[PDB]
Write a protein that binds this ligand. Structure first.
Ligand SMILES: *[C@@H]1O[C@H](CO[C@@H]2O[C@@H](C)[C@@H](O)[C@@H](O)[C@@H]2O)[C@@H](O[C@@H]2O[C@H](CO)[C@@H](O[C@@H]3O[C@H](CO[C@H]4O[C@H](CO)[C@@H](O)[C@H](O)[C@@H]4O[C@@H]4O[C@H](CO)[C@@H](O)[C@H](O)[C@H]4NC(C)=O)[C@@H](O)[C@H](O)[C@@H]3O)[C@H](O)[C@H]2NC(C)=O)[C@H](O)[C@H]1NC(C)=O
Ligand SMILES: *[C@@H]1O[C@H](CO)[C@@H](O[C@@H]2O[C@H](CO)[C@@H](O[C@@H]3O[C@H](CO)[C@@H](O)[C@H](O)[C@@H]3O)[C@H](O)[C@H]2NC(C)=O)[C@H](O)[C@H]1NC(C)=O
Ligand SMILES: *[C@@H]1O[C@H](CO[C@@H]2O[C@@H](C)[C@@H](O)[C@@H](O)[C@@H]2O)[C@@H](O[C@@H]2O[C@H](CO)[C@@H](O)[C@H](O)[C@H]2NC(C)=O)[C@H](O)[C@H]1NC(C)=O
Ligand SMILES: *[C@@H]1O[C@H](CO[C@@H]2O[C@@H](C)[C@@H](O)[C@@H](O)[C@@H]2O)[C@@H](O[C@@H]2O[C@H](CO)[C@@H](O)[C@H](O)[C@H]2NC(C)=O)[C@H](O)[C@H]1NC(C)=O
Ligand SMILES: *[C@@H]1O[C@H](CO[C@@H]2O[C@@H](C)[C@@H](O)[C@@H](O)[C@@H]2O)[C@@H](O)[C@H](O)[C@H]1NC(C)=O
Ligand SMILES: *[C@@H]1O[C@H](CO)[C@@H](O)[C@H](O)[C@H]1NC(C)=O
Ligand SMILES: *[C@@H]1O[C@H](CO)[C@@H](O)[C@H](O)[C@H]1NC(C)=O
Ligand SMILES: *[C@@H]1O[C@H](CO)[C@@H](O)[C@H](O)[C@H]1NC(C)=O
Lengths: 300, 182, 187, 283, 68
């Protein structure tokens, strides 16, 4: 039940079949509810010396994958009547053979708007809709139900189904792809179309506030300012911008008589608090002073 | 920004000719390319989306392809209506950018201009000014030197020639220039 | 039928600001991006920016940051562009699939001026010179439109803030300038 | 807010009745009329110009200062020359108490308790809180210790009035108007209080607005926002806990969760009716 | 809702395709306890094309209460 692929068998290249399962089977797959892949037949070679294949009750496994295995393994003419079930393999699967292409792509820092080719199966009634998948994907080493568009006419109408992605982190790469949800009809089924995986990177925007800043003076002239980076940089940080400004002395200090006996001059539950700091974090969405643009550093 | 380098700038062809235009992208656009057609009216029509997908009612003679960073619009067999301007447009990233454009011209037999010079009208002279006009009519190709304001016609819908007016001629067809004075 | 109906042509005084409209039809205005493009006469297309009518959300090309402002009126299904030079055509497009007709924006300080029409004659080629008018256009025919063969009417060219146009015929010039209610006939 | 005298703290911000946070430019509070914080604590944090904090004796304003959180202000890194009007103010180290250079903290005789006093030190009436315009008169209070009714501070709301928002007395008609303005919260009567909703185990006796106990589980109609709700977790299902009627449509899209089947039955087991449709998708 | 459903409202080929819709009854012919073991026998089942019988499947869990 737990397996979606047999690819974990990374180096398996031979099954000899010197011993076989009853009915002379060297490879037998029965009642694997989530199995979608055997091996990636574009990369993996597997040889089966003797014996047949048995496949029953693999609802997510396309018959094409099984037929590819027969081709790869050299088992092609070995299977007899009902060794591989036609009705219990792939019956519940995405065996999209056709290609949907994106007609339109638009970024916002928080949003992605997409359009894509309209798909219409033979009996268009059989189109249940579209399905858009997106995940945050930092490396390109890689759910929404979209109602079917407005059918009846086809002259000059952008019946391009689309979707506005709204959640999204800014300056973030998204793996995205669309699929057609259809009806396994009473005849030679229509498998439909899926788009390929496209990556889309949201726009950046203004960075979060620099965190935990500390101001110290080891010297009579030096100030050592240190800080941690914004909790939400929303982009590749270029620099930090520090301004300093000398504060004038307390006006009133020049007009107090300090010989007047009052000469004290200045010698110049945890998860309720956690959520508190976090509340304002979440609430947080000409003249010239001496400044400095701090590059590739978190101190000044 | 992604620069779309579109070639050729101009292309002379004949009815029935297969021709192609090319757009080379600065950066990977992953097939997010459109082809636009702009007519003499100034009206823009999108022909192709997603590199090769043809828009509705766009004649089947138009097609698109890619090989590497080079994207092409191919017209299998030119019809008169096709001799317009074409631009590609990438939609991969943030600032949508276009190609420089390509103008389709009808290739014709070369033709020397009919040069006519006209002295200022008596009415203009009464008014105080004097404009001498020289017409360079019905020539091909379009490239012509005259030796001030110039105004050139677009290609003639009937004979595929060009014409020019210079107000106050060296052409491929002559070894030495066509001289007209009064 | 998805349609984008544009404004203009807008004849404006130099330094004045102008607002152009793009009226949408045949679809839910709210749910699709409206893009704007600039095209200088004889040049190529340039992207200005876009607006999502439903959200009022906008995005500009750096080179148009202050020069253009995009707005939309959901109640009227119209998109607008307010501008801040010389002639330029401005296009409106619904996610690049459907384009507006384009609005011609001409920047000129000139007042209406009627043309001076001159007959020219010194097969045979004759000519007609139409000098120093404003604004465009002029309607020129020969023998009231009877003579159409062998005619070459040259595009008007702007000279010291006034237009000049010429025409030839190879074998009477009739010139009309709407703006000044001028109609001339020169043999 | 020169005259703000009482912060009752009926509802708090994480246990705080007063929050002053990241107020860049604030030099002083200056709430020189603030006499009492009835419930909750004070959080004054990260105000880099903020002074006149050490000069406030919060024990005169709150019963418990133990839960106050006053840190990372200019005051902490003693650059504050907090100088009070008598460089005259009452002192409570024994230090003078003020809000600004021009305003003292008001301190009454201990016999006055929380009631306040006039300038001459005469006690406000025992039903007053913090201050009054005339001594020993419950119609001259700036604020009430208990409840407010008909220009007077009262100990409790007498029948036929109801306690509202834990500070004022209101008549039946007022509570009725609130209830019908909803037809949000449709206000009810319970334990001599006009309240937003019936407590657990009670239901609205429609007519007289009175909460009466429910025989078995309480009926509860849940009207869904934009007529649909997608339940995709135990957390979202909890939002429907106690519902007996759904006015709208449910979409169930549950791909996992601990303690489910039992948790779903706890939160959705009382639904008897759904007015729209029921969709189970990718569950 | 009996007469309400039209063509392909309820799929014949994508509902129950992977399920145990056992309509017939197998009976236990024999039961034997040991402190550590249970031996059982039960009726033989043979479908029309007996070839179609993949086998049997026995399920057992510790059940203190018979509310299973
Ligand atoms: C599972 O596989 C086995 C083996 O499959 C064979 O080997 C593989 C590697 C491939 O080459 C296969 O194409 C090939 O079939 C199958 O077993 C085979 O079944 C067939 C059909 O029943 C037999 O052929 C027929 O044989 C009879 C005569 O009967 C044989 O078996 C009797 C068993 O009691 C003996 O009494 C007989 O004397 C006779 O014995 C055979 O003698 C020859 C030498 O003379 C030996 O090489 C054989 O090995 C031997 N048989 C045995 C069992 O030892 C004949 O009248 C008729 O015309 C056919 O020829 C195959 O002989 C038999 N082979 C083996 C090795 O068992 C299974 O049927 C497969 N099961 C399924 C469900 O597919
Ligand atoms: C601020 O004003 C109030 C006015 O009454 C002063 O008294 C405090 O009043 C609150 C109620 O308003 C009392 O709290 C209650 O305590 C009981 C338990 O004793 C509890 O059951 C209730 O739920 C509620 O919490 C509080 O006891 C009472 N305290 C005193 C000392 O009288 C309050 O003292 C004033 N403070 C200052 C510093 O002026
Ligand atoms: C005060 O500190 C500065 C900065 O110190 C640097 O950063 C510290 C966190 C630590 O890593 C130090 O070792 C670093 O030096 C001192 O200024 C620098 O000092 C070095 C010699 O140690 C010198 O080569 C640099 O040029 C100095 N930089 C500048 C801008 O002057 C400074 O000397 C310290 N002074 C005292 C009194 O402690
Ligand atoms: C029941 O109460 C209403 C409303 O009371 C008003 O609002 C309270 C919160 C409080 O401020 C009261 O003192 C207010 O009177 C009464 O309606 C008011 O009646 C007066 C005359 O007595 C009139 O001047 C106001 O305009 C009315 N205000 C409103 C909002 O209606 C109503 O009379 C009371 N009924 C009974 C039987 O006592
Ligand atoms: C796939 O594998 C086939 C069989 O492999 C050969 O036999 C096995 C038992 C090993 O000894 C192995 O090393 C041998 O190569 C090949 O015949 C076939 O060509 C292979 N195809 C590809 C594309 O590699
Ligand atoms: C993608 O590549 C990175 C290394 O560049 C690696 O850390 C990560 O695990 C990879 N993920 C997959 C699914 O291959
Ligand atoms: C109390 O209220 C009166 C109202 O006139 C005001 O003048 C006075 O300042 C306040 N009293 C105290 C003690 O703050
Ligand atoms: C079985 O009954 C007991 C009470 O006798 C109860 O504790 C247990 O949870 C029940 N189990 C089920 C699945 O009903």
């Amino acid at each position: 039940y737990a397996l979606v692929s047999l690819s974990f068998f990374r180096k398996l290249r031979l099954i000899r079949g010197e011993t076989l399962e009853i009915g002379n089977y060297s490879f037998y797959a029965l009642d694997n509810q989530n199995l979608r892949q055997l091996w990636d037949w574009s990369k993996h070679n597997l040889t089966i010396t003797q014996g047949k294949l048995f496949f029953h009750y693999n609802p997510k496994l396309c018959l094409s994958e099984i037929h590819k295995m027969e081709e790869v393994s050299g088992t092609k003419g070995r299977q007899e009547r009902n060794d591989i079930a036609l009705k219990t393999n792939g019956d519940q699967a995405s065996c999209e053979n056709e290609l949907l292409k994106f007609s339109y792509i638009r970024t916002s820092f928080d949003k992605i708007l997409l359009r894509w080719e309209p798909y219409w199966p033979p009996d268009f009634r059989d189109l249940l809709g579209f399905m858009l998948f997106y995940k945050e994907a930092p490396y390109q080493n890689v759910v929404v139900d979209i109602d079917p568009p407005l059918r009846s006419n086809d002259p000059k109408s952008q019946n391009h189904p689309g979707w506005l992605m709204r959640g999204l982190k800014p300056w973030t790469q998204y793996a995205i792809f669309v699929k057609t949800l259809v009806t396994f009809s009473d005849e030679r089924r229509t498998y439909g179309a899926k788009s390929d995986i496209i990556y889309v990177q949201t726009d950046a925007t203004n960075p979060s506030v620099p965190l935990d800043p500390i101001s110290v003076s080891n010297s009579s002239s030096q100030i050592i300012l240190k800080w941690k980076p914004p909790s939400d940089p929303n982009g590749n940080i270029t620099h930090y911008l520090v301004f300093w400004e000398r504060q004038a002395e307390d006006s009133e200090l020049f007009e107090l008589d300090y010989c007047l006996k009052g000469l004290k001059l200045p010698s110049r539950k945890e998860l309720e608090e956690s959520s508190f700091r976090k509340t304002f974090e979440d609430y947080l969405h000409e003249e010239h002073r001496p400044f400095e643009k701090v590059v590739n550093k978190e101190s000044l | 920004d992604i620069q779309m380098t579109q070639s050729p700038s101009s292309l002379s062809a004949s009815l029935g000719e297969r021709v192609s235009l090319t757009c080379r992208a600065s950066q990977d656009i992953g097939g997010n390319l459109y082809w636009l057609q702009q007519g003499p009216d100034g009206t823009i029509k999108r022909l192709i989306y997603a590199t090769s997908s043809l828009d509705s009612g766009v004649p089947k003679r138009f097609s698109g392809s890619r090989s590497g960073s080079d994207y092409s619009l191919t017209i299998s067999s030119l019809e008169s209506e096709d001799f317009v301007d074409y631009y590609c447009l990438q939609y991969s990233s943030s600032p949508w950018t276009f190609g420089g454009g390509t103008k389709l011209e009808i290739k014709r037999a070369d033709a020397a201009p009919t040069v006519s010079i006209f002295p200022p009208s008596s009415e203009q002279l009464t008014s105080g000014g004097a404009s001498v006009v020289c017409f360079l009519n019905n020539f091909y190709p379009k490239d012509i030197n005259v030796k001030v304001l110039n105004s050139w016609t677009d290609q003639d819908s009937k004979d595929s020639t060009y014409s020019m007016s210079s107000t106050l001629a060296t052409h491929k067809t002559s070894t030495s220039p066509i001289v007209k004075s009064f | 039928q998805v349609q984008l109906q544009q404004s203009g042509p807008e004849l404006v005084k130099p330094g004045a600001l102008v607002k152009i409209s793009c009226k949408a039809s045949g679809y839910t205005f709210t749910n699709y991006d409206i893009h704007w493009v600039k095209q200088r006469p004889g040049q190529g297309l340039e992207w200005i920016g876009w607006i999502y009518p439903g959200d009022g959300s906008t995005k500009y090309n750096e080179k148009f940051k202050g020069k253009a402002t995009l707005t939309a009126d959901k109640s009227s299904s119209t998109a607008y562009m307010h501008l801040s030079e010389k002639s330029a055509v401005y296009f409106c497009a619904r996610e690049w699939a459907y384009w507006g007709q384009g609005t011609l924006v001409t920047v000129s300080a000139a007042k209406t001026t009627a043309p001076s029409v001159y007959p020219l004659a010194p097969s045979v080629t004759l000519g007609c010179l139409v000098k120093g008018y404003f604004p465009e256009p002029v309607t020129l025919t020969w023998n009231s439109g009877s003579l159409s063969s062998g005619v070459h009417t040259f595009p008007a060219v702007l000279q010291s803030d006034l237009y000049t146009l010429s025409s030839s015929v190879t074998v009477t010039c009739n010139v009309a300038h709407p703006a000044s209610s001028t109609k001339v006939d020169k043999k | 807010f020169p005259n703000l005298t009482v912060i009752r703290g009926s509802r708090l911000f994480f246990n705080y009745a007063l929050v002053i946070f990241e107020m860049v430019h604030l030099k002083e509070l200056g709430l020189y009329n603030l006499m009492n914080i009835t419930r909750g604590s004070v959080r004054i944090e990260k105000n880099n110009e903020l002074c006149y904090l050490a000069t406030i004796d919060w024990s005169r304003i709150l019963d418990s200062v133990e839960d106050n959180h006053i840190v990372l202000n200019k005051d902490d890194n003693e650059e504050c020359g907090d100088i009070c009007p008598g460089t005259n103010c009452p002192a409570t180290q024994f230090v003078e108490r003020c809000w600004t250079h021009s305003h003292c903290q008001k301190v009454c005789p201990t016999i006055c308790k929380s009631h306040g006093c006039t300038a001459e030190g005469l006690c406000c009436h025992s039903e007053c809180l913090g201050n009054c315009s005339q001594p020993d008169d419950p119609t001259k209070c700036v604020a009430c210790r208990n409840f407010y009714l008909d220009g007077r501070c009262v100990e409790t709301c007498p029948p036929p009035y109801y306690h509202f928002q834990d500070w004022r007395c209101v008549n039946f008609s007022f509570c009725q108007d609130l209830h019908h303005k909803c037809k949000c919260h449709q206000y009810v009567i319970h334990n001599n209080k006009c309240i937003p909703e019936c407590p657990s185990g009670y239901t609205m006796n429609s007519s007289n607005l009175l909460c009466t106990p429910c025989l078995g589980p309480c009926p509860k109609v849940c009207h869904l926002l934009e007529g649909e709700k997608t339940i995709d977790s135990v957390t979202s299902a909890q939002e429907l806990r106690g519902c007996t009627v759904i006015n709208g449509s449910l979409i169930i899209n549950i791909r996992g969760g601990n303690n489910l089947a039992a948790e779903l039955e706890a939160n959705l087991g009382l639904i008897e009716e759904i007015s729209g449709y029921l969709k189970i998708r990718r569950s």
